[PDB]
């Protein structure tokens, strides 16, 4: 049994909140909701699609119909911000089955632009044979960036690395990128190039040997 | 009032094998189904099985069956799981959830159950890997304002820590996520923005400590 939840959501201090959790006749199925913030361990909100925990606030509420059930979330505060898994119970296979998970963003702060810097092979790790292209962009708002290398304009995939955006002291955001390339690739081009995208925008800077 | 406490979980090689334990408290243990999920590093929750109040039903989920064992000691407050024949794949974190056990009672019509987890542990870590302990290799990433910072990589296991000039300068640094290699070895980065105006005045000195090795490296950081 498959559960389709959506990636992320977005919405403002204020404003409620949506999030599809849907399957075949789910009506028939008990859904229920969790919600698990960055690092603490999971929490349920709301069970048997209707019913809720006492602790959890009026602004919590359960539907389920058709082909997909919601949860629905007003009123939103900032303490609000977490992922959200809808799960339910299998009778053909006994499974329990979760969803892919959605992650709110309560927006309160000024969207911002990446700062992308480009760091080519150090000096010494040269010497040690190796080659290490590091992309590093930052203070960007909202977290959720795109990056693509690319050598001589021709498009590069093999032997690529990203970390995941991670909020930074002054609450933006900053993501990390690397290329691994033997000495003698990084003689033989010409230039490498790592490439940004943000929202539509793509901030790019190139170094070459 | 109610908690759970896992543990157990430590350092795998694929192959090898691992019993964790959970233990409980603040409640009838007795009354009550258990559970066992995992959810790979930023990934998704994901179940493994599952056992009634007393061991009438437990069910595997389709991945880990034919690997994996779970059981209870209800004498004991405890909850245990056998893990076999194990995969990198299986290399997550570990949560013991709890159950209130609903269901509608039908002698003639069907026994149906309901589950739905309403108390979570913290859990446990668990890594399979087959690399070996080592310490990281630091080269310097040197440069109105300008960046520089280490380039700690190839190490293993978890975790690294970094500092600079002794902890004395905060303001402006962001200690990165390690991403994981192709072979298996982790590595990460340590940049601090500063004033390119105070540059040739001040010393940037990059404090590494990687504890799973007893390493130290120490490498200042200047223009070229």
């Known amino acids: 049994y498959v559960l389709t939840q959506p990636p992320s959501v977005s919405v403002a201090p204020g404003k409620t909140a949506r999030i599809t959790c849907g399957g075949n006749?789910?009506?028939?199925?008990?859904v229920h909701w969790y919600q698990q913030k960055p690092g603490q361990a999971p929490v349920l909100v709301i069970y048997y699609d209707d019913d809720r925990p006492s602790g959890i606030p009026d602004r919590f509420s359960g539907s389920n119909s058709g082909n997909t059930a919601t949860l629905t979330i007003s009123r939103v505060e900032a303490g609000d911000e977490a992922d959200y898994y809808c799960?339910?119970?299998?009778?053909?296979?006994?499974?329990?089955?979760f969803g892919g998970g959605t992650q709110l963003t309560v927006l309160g702060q000024p969207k911002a632009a990446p700062s992308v810097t480009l760091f080519p092979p150090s000096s010494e790790e040269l010497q040690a044979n190796k080659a290490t292209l590091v992309c590093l962009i930052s203070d960007f708002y909202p977290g959720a960036v795109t990056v693509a290398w690319k050598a001589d304009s021709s498009p590069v995939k093999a032997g690529v690395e990203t970390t995941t955006p991670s909020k930074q002291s002054n609450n933006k955001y900053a993501a990390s990128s690397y290329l691994s390339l033997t000495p003698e690739q990084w003689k033989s081009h010409r230039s490498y190039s790592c490439q940004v995208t943000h929202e539509g925008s793509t901030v790019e800077k190139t170094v070459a040997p | 009032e109610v908690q759970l406490v896992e543990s157990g979980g430590n350092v795998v090689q694929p192959g090898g094998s691992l019993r964790l334990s959970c233990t409980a408290s603040?409640?009838?243990?007795?009354?009550?189904?258990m559970h066992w999920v995992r959810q790979a590093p930023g990934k998704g929750l994901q179940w493994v099985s599952l056992?009634?109040?007393?061991?009438?039903?437990?069910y595997y989920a389709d991945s880990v069956k034919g690997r994996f064992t779970i059981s209870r000691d209800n004498s004991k407050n405890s909850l245990y799981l056998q893990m076999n024949s194990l995969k990198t794949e299986d290399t997550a974190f570990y949560f013991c959830?709890?159950?209130?056990?609903?269901?509608?009672?039908?002698?003639?019509?069907?026994?149906?159950?309901?589950?739905?987890?309403?108390?979570w542990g913290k859990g446990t870590t668990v890594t399979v890997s087959s690399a070996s302990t080592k310490g990281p290799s630091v080269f310097p990433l040197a440069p109105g304002t300008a960046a520089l910072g280490c380039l700690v990589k190839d190490y293993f296991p978890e975790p690294v820590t970094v500092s600079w000039n002794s902890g004395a300068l905060t303001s402006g640094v962001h200690t990165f996520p390690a991403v994981l290699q192709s072979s298996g070895l982790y590595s990460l980065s340590s940049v601090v923005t500063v004033p390119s105006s105070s540059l040739g005045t001040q010393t940037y000195i990059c404090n590494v400590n990687h504890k799973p090795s007893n390493t130290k490296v120490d490498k200042r950081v200047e223009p070229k």
């Open positions: 799960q339910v119970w299998d009778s053909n296979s006994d499974h329990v089955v």
């Open positions: 959830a709890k159950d209130k056990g609903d269901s509608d009672y039908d002698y003639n019509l069907g026994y149906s159950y309901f589950y739905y987890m309403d108390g």
């Open positions: 056992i009634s109040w007393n061991g009438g039903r437990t």
């Open positions: 603040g409640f009838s243990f007795d009354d009550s189904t």
């Open positions: 006749n789910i009506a028939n199925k008990n």
